[PDB]
Amino acid sequence: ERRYLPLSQARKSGFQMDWLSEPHPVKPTFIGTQVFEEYDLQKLVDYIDWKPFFDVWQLRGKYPNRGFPKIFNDKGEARKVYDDAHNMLNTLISQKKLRARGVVGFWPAQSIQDDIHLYAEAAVPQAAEPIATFYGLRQQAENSTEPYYCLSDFIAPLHSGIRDYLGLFAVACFGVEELSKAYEDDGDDYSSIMVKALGDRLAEAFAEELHERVRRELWAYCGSEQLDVADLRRLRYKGIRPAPGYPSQPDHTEKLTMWRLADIEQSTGIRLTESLAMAPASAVSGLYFSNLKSKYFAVGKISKDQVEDYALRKNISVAEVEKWLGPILGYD
Amino acid sequence: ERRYLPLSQARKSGFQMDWLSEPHPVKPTFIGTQVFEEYDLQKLVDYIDWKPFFDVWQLRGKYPNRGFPKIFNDKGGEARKVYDDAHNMLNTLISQKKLRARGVVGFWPAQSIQDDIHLYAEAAVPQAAEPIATFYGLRQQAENTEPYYCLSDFIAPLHSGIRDYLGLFAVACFGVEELSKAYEDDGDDYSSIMVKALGDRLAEAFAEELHERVRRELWAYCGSEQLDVADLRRLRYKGIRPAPGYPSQPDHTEKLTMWRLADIEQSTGIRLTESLAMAPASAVSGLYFSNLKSKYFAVGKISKDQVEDYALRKNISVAEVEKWLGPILGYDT
Secondary structure, X not given: OOOEOOHHHHHHOEOOOOHHHOOOOOOOOOOEEEEEOOOOHHHHHOOOOOHHHHHHHHHHHHOOOXXXXXXXXXXXXXXXXXXXXXXXXXXXXXXXXXXXXXXEEEEEEEEEOOEEEEOOOOOOHHHOOOOEEEEOOOOOEOOOOOOEOOHHHHOOEOOOOOOEEEEEEEXXXXXXXXXXXXXHHOOOXXXXXXXXXXXXXXXXXXXXXXXXXHHHHHOOOOOOOOOOHHHHHOOOOOOEOOXXXXXXXXXXXXXXXXXXXXXXXXXXXXXXXXXXXXXXXXXXXXXXXXXXXXXXXXXXXXXXHHHHHHHHHXXXXXXXXXHHOHHHEOOO | OOOEOOHHHHHHOEOOOOOOXXXXXXXXXXXXXXXXXXXXXXXXHOOOOOHHHHHHHHHHXXXXXXXXXXXXXXXXXXXXXXXXXXXXXXXXXXXXOOOEEEEEEEXXXXXXXXXXXXXXXXXXXXXXXXXXXXXXXXXXXXXXXXXXXXXXXXXXXXXXXXXXXXXXXXXXXXXXXXXXXXXXXHOOHHHHHHHHHHHHHHHHHHHHHXXXXXXXXXXXXXXXXXXXXXXXXXXXXXXXXXXXXXXXXXXXXXXXXXXXXXXXXXXXXXXXXXXXXXXXXXXEEEEEEOOOOXXXXXXXXXXXHHHHHHHHHHOOOHHHHHHHOHXXXXXXX
């Protein structure tokens, strides 16, 4: 008996930016991509969010493998895993046994209804064929009233007379899978767990630091920003970096467009697997939105009308859309 | 080229209790099962481990669904709101009997033979009797002075002349799935997430409080224990409550024996699904070990020799064992 608003009505009640009263989006410092063939891993250490790392060790530490430090047999563990993490980081960074690569890109962007079109640097968007499209999905489930969000709501309409921009990034830590296997071959499960956890921390730190670098320098829509790492975790900054597959746009296949547009694989070695997971696994990607009114949200469950409309926009079958949007189908 | 000890050698270097000098196992206050048709949900609130609850809300709160409280759209505010909402929902659902808890505890004479634990009838002389059930063990085998653990190491050998015992439990919070669907039907995703999170918290609280009751009262091997809930989370008490499928014995099919022996489904309504998950989902089960020196551990990866021996002991095919123990096979199929 769950109620869903028909797509046309959800669109009429979409999030309204009031573009007539909006300031002009800032043009990024370049259009196209910038590639990082290496990155300063020591600098990233300061951006690490240690909570998920301690979560890993709480989970694994309850059932220690043979060969764990003696402290796991006590009635202390957090300090020991933290110190061991720092020793490993020092050794692996200095020996260059871990390395990071990434890419950032920016393009002119404008919205048409639920979708975001990107254009060539020198193009007049109204006069030009888009070079890429990032498709949006819109909230539909029922519960003035709150708007029905879609990521396209955060980008200026094609006909608004306002030029907008969209960015993207992909980052990864390389060497993790190889080191973990080597540790395991040596019978050292503790170090394997450790390097896997650290790889994840480094990739996320890279995403965080690079986002700050994008806000202040590369896009520079907030050049005066001066926030601590703790404030970054709390999302005290403006703009968002949502990745395909996450609740704001659950369609993983949007990664294909990111990879094509920014030539990500040939630029960074970061691959998309058949399930559209990133390889190496210690990797993060996303689209950058600069509007200070942008926010994360969950699309939530959607109706058949939106699935059909989305299929037509992407030129794929309903069955194909239903494969990738399975968990958010609001119908049988 | 990862090294594994042959099974016979891993067994020779198993954890050795030295049973003559250790405190003798205490006979529980009953043999067989005790069923809880209802349980004091309010009492369980004090035993809640809130960390995983706050983790759920950190994850969901980043991407709020339409209809969430207005604070999710702001710049401490979220944690405050979800916690007060949690306590309000707990109070309302408990008082209105819209959630209810059921469970069962059982105890039986138990003795080990090598890697396995046999259970016996109350009046049986274990050396003279056919076991009424067997809980099979798996032993650490991967190489690195430390022993190679198996759960059976925590139970007195059949021929030690020392009588031992094993317990088990299964508990669940009923009503969670139904309330969640009802909330969702109205379009209230916030409350659906909340009740699911609370159901999980209550089931885990029931497991914790019941284990304490087992240690102090029902088994009563630690009748003089008095630990606060924070110390319970730190595993400051003695004895363990490992469940089939967890790293100490990754074979989920051992749940079938638990369910058969203690007549769990008919006693409590808690079922095992085709995948051997518990239904309802807000549920916890395990085996109770009372030994002062029992501890959780990960079996880790095992060799073909142990897979073949385990299959022989359980009277099942090697193919089936390799299916159930897939993740811990230390060799290629």
